[PDB]
Amino acid sequence: DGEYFTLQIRGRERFEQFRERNEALELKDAQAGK
Amino acid sequence: DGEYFTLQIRGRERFEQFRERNEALELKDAQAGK
């Protein structure tokens, strides 16, 4: 098993920022990070 | 009723970025936006 987190938003104008960021940040950790 | 969105992440280093952003972006729309 393991643990994680989850965020919810009711605005599409803001989501576009997180979603797109999710991909960018996803690479930040998946690659190096230390 | 209505509609919204939800994002999930399994990394704390990245979440800190979205979470903190969630508050910042939340104000972007909640205030003006057009």
Beta bridge mates, B8: A6
Residue B10 — left, alpha, or beta (φ > 0 → left; ψ -120 to 50 → alpha)? alpha
CA triple B33-B1-B26, angle to 5 deg: 30
Cβ of B4 and A2 within 8 Å? no
CA–CA min distance A31, chain B (Å): 12
Experimental method: NMR
Distance CA A13, CA A16 (A): 6
Q: Please name the amino acid found at residue A31.
A: Q
Domain boundaries, chain B: 1-34
CB A21, CB B20: distance < 8 Å:
no
In this complex, the residue of A3, A10, A28 whose CB is nearest that of residue B14 is A28
Side-chain-side CA neighbours of residue B21 (13 Å): 19
Chain A residue whose CA is closest to B30: A11
| Residue B10, token pair as written in the block | 């399994």
